[PDB]
Each structure stands twice: as C-alpha cells, then as structure tokens.
Amino acid sequence: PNFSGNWKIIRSENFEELLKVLGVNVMLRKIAVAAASKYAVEIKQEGDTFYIKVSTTVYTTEINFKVGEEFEEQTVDGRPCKSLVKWESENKMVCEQKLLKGEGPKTSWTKELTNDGELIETMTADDVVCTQVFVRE
Ligand SMILES: *C/C=C(C)/C=C/C=C(C)/C=C/C1=C(C)CCCC1(C)C
Known part of the structure; x- marks a missing residue:
C-alpha cells in the first residue's frame, strides 16, 4: 500500500x-460543514510510519504516528486524546x-485506500x- 500523496x-x-x-x-455546525469543503490531507508514509497534515482554509495540523504505538492527538471536537x-x-x-480528561462519546477514525x-x-x-472521500491532486 502507499497512502502517500496530496488528497x-x-x-x-x-x-x-x-x-x-x-x-x-447548530450555527457553528453549519460553519464547520462549510469549512470541510476545503478539507485537504497530505500523507507521507514510510513502512508503518505516517506523517499526516490536515488543513482547511485557515487551519492546519500535523499528526505523526507509527502503527501499533500509542500517541497523543485530539478528537474531532478538539479534546486531547490518546490514540x-x-x-x-x-x-x-x-x-x-x-480521552485524556473527562468523559464523552466513543470516538475513532479509519483510513482506506480503495482499488x-x-x-x-x-x-x-x-x-x-x-x-x-478524496482523490489525488
Ligand atoms: C487520518 C486523518 C485524521 C486523523 C483526520 C482528522 C481530521 C479532523 C479532526 C478534521 C476536523 C475538521 C473540523 C473539526 C472542522 C473543519 C473541517 C475538518 C474536517 C477539517
């Protein structure tokens, strides 16, 4: 597999x-939905080490992980978590x-490369x- 690319x-x-x-x-939900129409993902994969940059028009953030090794990021609504x-x-x-602190709904994510x-x-x-769903740029 190779997730590497600009999506x-x-x-x-x-x-x-x-x-x-x-x-x-509700008002911030609609604004967030609009921001997602400019959601872009940049992935660099080497083996089972991943570098991922998530961005919209005004915000960007980097996630770095290796498969099978715990790391820290944030949930979708922004709370810090262990993943x-x-x-x-x-x-x-x-x-x-x-969640690192408090309680909340059970959250998760997946990534898949289709044929x-x-x-x-x-x-x-x-x-x-x-x-x-994304395509390469
Ligand atoms: C492997 C991909 C990951 C972990 C993607 C994470 C993406 C997000 C937490 C996206 C969040 C968004 C918002 C909270 C509002 C604006 C639109 C998004 C989709 C960028």
Whole structure:
C-alpha cells in the first residue's frame, strides 16, 4: 500500500450529525460543514510510519504516528486524546481514541485506500459515522 500523496476532498457525508453528537451548536455546525469543503490531507508514509497534515482554509495540523504505538492527538471536537492505530487489511487502518480528561462519546477514525485510487476517511462518535472521500491532486 502507499497512502502517500496530496488528497483533495470530493465528498463528505454525515459530518453535521457527527458534530451534533459531539455537542456543537447548530450555527457553528453549519460553519464547520462549510469549512470541510476545503478539507485537504497530505500523507507521507514510510513502512508503518505516517506523517499526516490536515488543513482547511485557515487551519492546519500535523499528526505523526507509527502503527501499533500509542500517541497523543485530539478528537474531532478538539479534546486531547490518546490514540492507537492498527491495520484491518492491506489498505485500511483503524484508530481507537481515549480521552485524556473527562468523559464523552466513543470516538475513532479509519483510513482506506480503495482499488479505484480514492482515499476514504471515516470519523465515528458512538452510532454516527461521517464518511469523507478524496482523490489525488
Ligand atoms: C487520518 C486523518 C485524521 C486523523 C483526520 C482528522 C481530521 C479532523 C479532526 C478534521 C476536523 C475538521 C473540523 C473539526 C472542522 C473543519 C473541517 C475538518 C474536517 C477539517
């Protein structure tokens, strides 16, 4: 597999519903949904070490991890968490998250490379799955 690339979003589903679960009020939900239409992902993969840069028009953030080794990032709504990524198959990985402080919904994410050259990202909070699809730039 090689997730490496510059990915641009073509589709985003259930993002507002995910943010609702996470407690975001309606006006900021709509504003966040609009910002997601400029969501871009840059990935550099070497073996099972990943460097990922998530960006929108006004914000950018870097996630660095190795499969099977705990690291710290933040949940979608911004709370700090501890994460662990594992492979599910040749071209799909899953991340489980645990809040560093307090309680909240159970969150996770996945990344998948399809046979058609798309990148599929999902983000989950409890019952609600947001799916976002990307192509290479
Ligand atoms: C492997 C990919 C990961 C861990 C992606 C993480 C992406 C996010 C936490 C995205 C968050 C967003 C918002 C909270 C509002 C603006 C739109 C997004 C999708 C960039």
